[PDB]
């Protein structure tokens, strides 16, 4: 039977999300039938379920926006997809948390199947965001530096690899944790040049730590508040701090003096917006670019924990945690 | 005697600034002599004396960055200025609060003598800031809307007129005051399409007040804090909020959701930097363009109080006040 994770109300996922059976539709022409392979659980998925997000699928909705599916069949007039093909959603809002679906062929985009399933299941979001943010805001050349916060996130980790494979120098801010030393070695082996604490940055010894290497023209923010204020402080005259995450109650603060005399810029990044503003093919090249790095071992999936659709509540809970050790991946 | 308003230490103007007699230099070569006609007292002058500014002239310094003057005599090789010529400063830092001075010819710029001297004394700063902010961030067409705060300030007032001459629609936010009704009628007659309070803007009836007319792609900030976040809320997707002033302890606050899902941009504008990044001819073009609005009565001088250089403390005092009725102008 067809099992799906659906929420009829907006609220705390562990309460809102419930497992349901669904009848499949008909492959009526341009439609495509898929068997979900793996669906991660991401923060944007949680926010959506909570009702705090830029795009809200009508209730009752199927949870999830990212994941890999294998084509099982195609509609009378489907040209680009043959069964056995691997697909990911063309844009957010699809509802990936379900065993099987029938989707319009334009809501999907084929990915190579010669990559690790785990990579394919998590390629459409974090690595794309990381890549775009490195490209679309400042023109970075090898030797140039990038400063970021939440460096242990799915995005930060991907930014570290991509940056490295790009010939860039990353200075990464990580949250204070019991063993910040364990983390350091981890990211450093990911390509990270510098790993510093939210603390080491807000000390007085920062105006000089950043002395030997070139100041960053790009800052990546996902935290906000004082963390974000400190990122702004590390920027060179005219640099850009792109915010791509954070809390709805943890706003970004910009010094009047930093905006005027240092001419800093503050922007946002929304992958769904870029995907909707661009052609399917353009999203396709980005994927091709990311598969390239994968094949040459320069981009690797992060800690995965595969959970059967059956036990979504445990997975769901584990993702609500700020210190979640590994990415929860729903499998069916 | 050559009188000047100088400060040997940085700090509260009403304390640091004192009248000093000075010895004039020699018209050595490219130097240019001038008799100060009138010098306004601007916020950037205050921040300069106080010490909180991006360009600080070495102490002891003469106060003032704006003003009109007449050429008395020129140096051995002066090509463009003949005595009796009216000039203003080419860039900030010159030190205009004095009766007489000798400036290098490049530090000056001729102003047509067929504009009022009153206009000419406030032309090099506020109207320039306004016109640049209307041009350098968003490409506005006739019919487009713009929003600003501190609409009753020198800049705000110039924005209203220039925006009007530009065929644009302004929505002007004024601070709350005993009789916000007097102010409103004033600005409205300057061309302001709407005049609104800080209060009226933070109610709920705002998500709809902006329903009939088009949303602005441009927001002009001078306050910061909650007022700057409310200005932020009124922007159309992709809009820019430009900050050209405010308190050093009243930073700009950007909501995560606004930067991300609305793709809002936050910038700064510093006239002094634009003037240094650009050619004299480019400054001359700006000046000619502004002098044209004046000529046609589309840009008029703001209210002022003229004060002999003698009583400077009086004018200084008046200007450090948040509700200052008129621009304090020094005469010599």
From Swiss-Prot, chains A, B:
InterPro entries: ADH-like_C, ADH-like_N, GroES-like_sf, Mito_Enoyl-ACP_Reductase, NAD(P)-bd_dom_sf, PKS_ER. Changing residue 124 to S: Strongly increases activity with trans-oct-2-enoyl-CoA. Decreases activity with trans-tetradec-2-enoyl-CoA by 73%. Decreases activity with trans-hexadec-2-enoyl-CoA by 80%. One of its GO terms (molecular function) is enoyl-[acyl-carrier-protein] reductase (NADPH) activity. Changing residue 44 to A: Reduces catalytic activity by 68%. Changing residue 129 to A: Reduces catalytic activity by 69%. NADP(+) binds at residues 126, 152-155, 175-177, 244-247, 269-271, 327. Its EC number is 1.3.1.104. One of its GO terms (cellular component) is mitochondrion. The modification N6-acetyllysine is found at residues 20, 211, 226. Keywords: Acetylation, Cytoplasm, Disease variant, Dystonia, Fatty acid biosynthesis, Fatty acid metabolism, Lipid biosynthesis, Lipid metabolism, Mitochondrion, NADP, Nucleus, Oxidoreductase, Transit peptide. The active site is at 53 (proton donor). The keyword Nucleus applies. Belongs to the zinc-containing alcohol dehydrogenase family. Quinone oxidoreductase subfamily. It is linked to Dystonia, childhood-onset, with optic atrophy and basal ganglia abnormalities: An autosomal recessive neurologic disorder characterized by childhood-onset dystonia, basal ganglia degeneration and optic atrophy with decreased visual acuity. Dystonia is defined by the presence of sustained involuntary muscle contraction, often leading to abnormal postures. DYTOABG severity is variable, and some patients lose independent ambulation. Optic atrophy 16: A disease characterized by visual impairment in association with optic atrophy. Atrophy of the optic disk indicates a deficiency in the number of nerve fibers which arise in the retina and converge to form the optic disk, optic nerve, optic chiasm and optic tracts. OPA16 is an autosomal recessive form. Patients also show mild sensorineural hearing impairment. PANTHER family: ENOYL-[ACYL-CARRIER-PROTEIN] REDUCTASE, MITOCHONDRIAL. Catalyzes the NADPH-dependent reduction of trans-2-enoyl thioesters in mitochondrial fatty acid synthesis (fatty acid synthesis type II). Fatty acid chain elongation in mitochondria uses acyl carrier protein (ACP) as an acyl group carrier, but the enzyme accepts both ACP and CoA thioesters as substrates in vitro. Displays a preference for medium-chain over short- and long-chain substrates. May provide the octanoyl chain used for lipoic acid biosynthesis, regulating protein lipoylation and mitochondrial respiratory activity particularly in Purkinje cells. This is Enoyl-[acyl-carrier-protein] reductase, mitochondrial. The lineage of its organism: Eukaryota, Metazoa, Chordata, Craniata, Vertebrata. The gene is MECR.
